[PDB]
């Protein structure tokens, strides 16, 4: 094929380039240190009331989904929109938690769609939300035996506004047309209800710290990310290493040269990269491409056999009877301790010959 | 609030050269017993550096052209940072890097700063609203020893380099830029970029013996070797003699 | 389906101001999210400003970064569009899109749009 | 086809939009010519034209060379609506207005 002929003289003629195919994907990006501060919504003081539920606007951080376990039992993982999973492959440019203590008897209420008493008159959840909604029990944290309460809500309510508004307006509320304007009595009291947190009461109405997070996207680009690859560091192979910005194939391995705190890479004569540091764990490495040559077919003619012989220029024959010469390996001869006329010259003092059964010979 | 100092007038500054000296890392590469040819801003040699000395209070505004080399032989640390602004009108913004007790603070602000800024910080007055804070805990700093302190500030495409290196020198005749290399190191990459062309230094006077050589930089293409452990053993100017550039 | 329109200005001088009003109307605005989008004569589309409902931050973008700010008023139902240092490359027919931040890329309602010209 | 003034240019090789998305998408390697005039005296009336359709939603970009003429029903949200044609349940295929 690469003689444009279908009768081959007598002699070696290189064909083309062997070369060693990478193995892995290893990334190795650096250890994120910009989190997002997701500790001052789950691990704050006790809790924010549900009339005035506060967010805070989580945007321009890395937020991993991860810090969130290792926690209370937290249950009732209910998220709308994504899969529980696989939030750590996507990013929203804004992120909206809510805090608020509601009764636990009915949590179901607060879901889209699902409508009634609670989440009616305090906070309304859109049919469309695409967050994560997750709630656990804080009674050992957040009770006393005397009656608690610290955390009010809404009852006197006269219809369905908009969602997603804090109602923090408590002006005097009429049941009817009856002008009372400003009584203070039966029929017209004060539209604000309150709470008693007793851990003698059951688990039916007991608090519960509940959380929702709304993911908002818009045209802005993307801020809120997730964590990255970081795969595991594997050397002694050939892997397509994908560093911050050196990308490429070779081999890695141990290197003794002892880099500069401030310098992360290294060149070298042709200007190609040779040592690399590891970002997240300081260990320098030396980026070597796998084994590499030219293969060479010597045929002692299609006029009188077919049996060829391969060498591979530049390799140790181990990484392909065989044998090792200076010139590279040798596969498809075989070594004689004698020695004839050079007839197919291959190098290092070493040539080929088709003697006598018939086979190719190297001496 | 600021107060200008009295009794204090003029002084005409001397000149003096630089033994080859001003001399830092290009790139962030690493490279051993490699003569790379470099195109960027460095010190050429044998400059007549400025002689700015105080025993008394020499503090004038000098320009920040293309780069700024500042070295320092002191032994009671005078000198604790710097101002660099285009106007110095409170109207733009303008870095200032302050030395504290036990960290360095570097703010980009356009703070009060007054005609005579010194040295617990009585240089301005107010704050107005600033697009960059950093404190960096780790800050910048025998009888018969002396510091010398080296600072190379390069202002090119946006981000404001900062080259330090620290040295103990022995105290000689009447003092100036001594023989060898330094190679200084990059220590400072902040994300900036506002427009710098004037700056000034900050002294502190510890009411109950130093001196800066400030240079300038200019495009040169100079010779590097590195040695095998990866650091810089001497400099080819390549534009100072004829056996400069035939090396 | 439910759509209002858009008023203002149709020419300014190169320098001058102008105060564009998205009017709405019968909708549920303030859990929604409102911007702008203009369109170049003889180009496609580009995204100007947005404003959100839940918590009102506003995002421009990278060109009229200092140069065009809005503000959503509830009362009214309307958004406004107050441009400053009008350039002469800049004209462009704005178009109001509001979208629900729980959903897709795709916006859901477009305005109307006017074109103004700039000398 | 019929189209609007402005989306004359999404008709080109590599040109996005809308009309290049869903409607009518051209490969890269188009070898083709595309001729367009102006029809306001034989398309339009001052009575309210609504007699031209033209698909703003789609799952996905319409590949080059395909004739969409389903009526699926678009789904703008999470919402199974089975068909309705109501909240975040758009038509996906809308009318122009030609005056
Ligand atoms: C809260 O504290 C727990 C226990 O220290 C920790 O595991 C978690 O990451 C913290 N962060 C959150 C989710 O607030
Ligand atoms: C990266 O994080 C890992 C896990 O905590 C830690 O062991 C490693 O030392 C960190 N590397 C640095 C220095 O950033
Ligand atoms: C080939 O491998 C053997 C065993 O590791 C080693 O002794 C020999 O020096 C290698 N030769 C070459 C050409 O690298
Ligand atoms: C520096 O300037 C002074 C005054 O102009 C001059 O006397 C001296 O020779 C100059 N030195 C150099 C290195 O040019
Ligand atoms: C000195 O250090 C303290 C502690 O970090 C800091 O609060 C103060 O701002 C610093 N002072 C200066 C010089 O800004
Ligand atoms: C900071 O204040 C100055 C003076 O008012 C102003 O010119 C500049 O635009 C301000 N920058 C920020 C961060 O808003
Ligand atoms: C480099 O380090 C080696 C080992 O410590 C040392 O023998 C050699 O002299 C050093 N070279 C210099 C002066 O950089």
């Known amino acids: 094929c690469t003689l444009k002929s279908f009768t081959v003289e007598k002699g070696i003629y290189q064909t083309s380039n062997f070369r060693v195919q990478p193995t892995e994907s290893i990334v190795r990006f650096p250890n994120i240190t910009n989190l997002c501060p997701f500790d001052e919504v789950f691990n704050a003081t006790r809790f924010a009331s549900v009339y005035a539920w506060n967010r805070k606007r989580i945007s321009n951080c890395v937020a991993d989904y991860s810090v969130l376990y290792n926690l209370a039992p937290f249950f009732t993982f209910k998220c709308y929109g994504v899969s529980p999973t696989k939030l750590n492959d996507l990013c929203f440019t804004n992120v909206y938690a809510d805090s608020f203590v509601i009764r636990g008897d009915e949590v179901r209420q607060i879901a889209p769609g699902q409508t009634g008493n609670i989440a009616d008159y305090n906070y309304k959840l859109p049919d469309d939300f695409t967050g994560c909604v997750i709630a656990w029990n804080s009674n050992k944290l957040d009770s006393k035996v005397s009656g608690n309460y610290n955390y009010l809500y809404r009852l006197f309510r006269k219809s369905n506004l908009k969602p997603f508004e804090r109602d923090i307006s408590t002006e005097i509320y009429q049941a009817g047309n009856k002008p009372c304007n400003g009584v203070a009595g039966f029929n017209c009291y004060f539209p604000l209800r309150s709470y008693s947190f007793r851990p003698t009461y059951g688990v039916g109405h007991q608090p519960y710290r509940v959380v929702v997070l709304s993911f908002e996207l818009l045209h802005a680009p993307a801020t809120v990310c997730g964590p990255k690859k970081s795969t595991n560091l594997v050397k002694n192979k050939c892997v397509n290493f994908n560093f911050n910005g050196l990308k490429g194939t070779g081999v890695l391995t141990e290197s003794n040269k002892k880099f500069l705190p401030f310098q992360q890479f290294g060149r070298d004569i042709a200007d190609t990269t040779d040592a690399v540091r590891d970002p997240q764990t300081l260990e320098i490495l030396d980026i070597t491409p796998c084994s590499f040559g030219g293969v060479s077919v010597i045929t002692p003619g299609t006029n009188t056999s077919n049996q060829v012989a391969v060498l591979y220029q530049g390799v140790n024959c181990t990484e392909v009877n065989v044998f090792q010469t200076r010139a590279g390996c040798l596969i498809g001869a075989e070594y004689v301790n004698n020695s004839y006329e050079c007839d197919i010259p291959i190098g290092a003092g070493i040539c080929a010959s088709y003697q006598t059964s018939q086979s190719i010979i190297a001496y | 609030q600021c107060v200008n100092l009295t009794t204090r007038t003029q002084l005409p500054p001397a000149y003096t050269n630089s033994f080859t000296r001003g001399v830092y890392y290009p790139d962030k590469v690493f490279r051993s017993s490699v003569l790379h040819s470099t195109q960027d801003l460095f010190l050429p040699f044998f400059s007549n550096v400025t002689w700015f000395h105080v025993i008394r209070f020499d503090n004038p505004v000098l320009p920040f052209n293309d780069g700024v080399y500042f070295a320092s032989i002191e032994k009671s640390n005078i000198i604790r940072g710097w101002i660099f602004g285009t106007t110095l009108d409170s109207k733009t913004q303008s870095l200032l890097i302050v030395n504290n007790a036990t960290n360095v603070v570097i703010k980009v602000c356009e703070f009060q700063f007054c005609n005579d800024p010194f040295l617990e910080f009585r240089v301005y007055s107010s704050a107005n609203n600033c697009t960059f804070e950093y404190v960096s805990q780790p800050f910048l700093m025998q009888g018969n020893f002396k510091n010398l302190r080296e600072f190379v500030f390069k202002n090119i495409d946006g981000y404001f380099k900062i080259y330090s290196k620290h040295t103990p020198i022995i105290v000689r005749e009447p003092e100036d830029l001594p023989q060898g290399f330094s190679a200084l190191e990059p220590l400072v990459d902040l994300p900036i970029g506002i427009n710098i062309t004037r700056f000034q230094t900050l002294l502190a006077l510890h009411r109950s013996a130093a001196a800066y050589y400030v240079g300038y930089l200019q495009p040169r293409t100079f010779l590097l070797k590195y040695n095998e452990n990866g650091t810089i053993t001497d400099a080819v100017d390549c534009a100072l003699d004829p056996l400069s550039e035939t090396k | 389906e439910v759509q209002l329109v858009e008023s203002g200005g149709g020419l300014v001088q190169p320098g001058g101001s102008l105060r564009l009003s998205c009017a709405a109307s019968?909708?549920?605005?303030?859990?929604?999210?409102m911007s702008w989008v203009r369109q170049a004569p003889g180009q496609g589309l580009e995204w100007v400003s947005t404003?959100?409902?839940?918590?009102?931050?506003?995002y421009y973008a990278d060109s009229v970064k200092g140069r065009f700010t809005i503000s959503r008023d509830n009362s009214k139902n309307t958004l406004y569009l107050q441009m400053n240092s009008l350039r002469a490359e800049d004209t462009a027919l704005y178009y109001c899109?509001?979208?629900?931040?729980?959903?897709?890329?795709?916006?859901?309602?477009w305005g109307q749009g006017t074109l103004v010209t700039v000398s | 086809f019929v189209i609007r003034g402005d989306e004359v240019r999404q008709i080109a090789p590599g040109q996005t939009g809308n009309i290049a998305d869903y409607n009518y998408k051209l490969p890269d390697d188009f070898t083709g010519c595309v001729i367009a005039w102006n029809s306001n005296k034989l398309d339009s009336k001052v009575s309210g034209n609504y007699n031209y359709l033209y698909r703003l939603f789609r799952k996905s970009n319409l590949k080059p060379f395909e004739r969409d003429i389903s009526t699926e029903i678009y789904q703008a949200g999470n919402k199974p609506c089975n068909g309705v044609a109501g909240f975040n349940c758009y038509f996906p295929l809308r009318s122009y207005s030609f005056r």
């Open positions: 899109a509001t979208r629900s931040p729980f959903g897709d890329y795709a916006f859901s309602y």
């Open positions: 019968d909708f549920y605005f303030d859990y929604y999210e």
């Open positions: 404003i959100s409902g839940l918590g009102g931050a506003t």
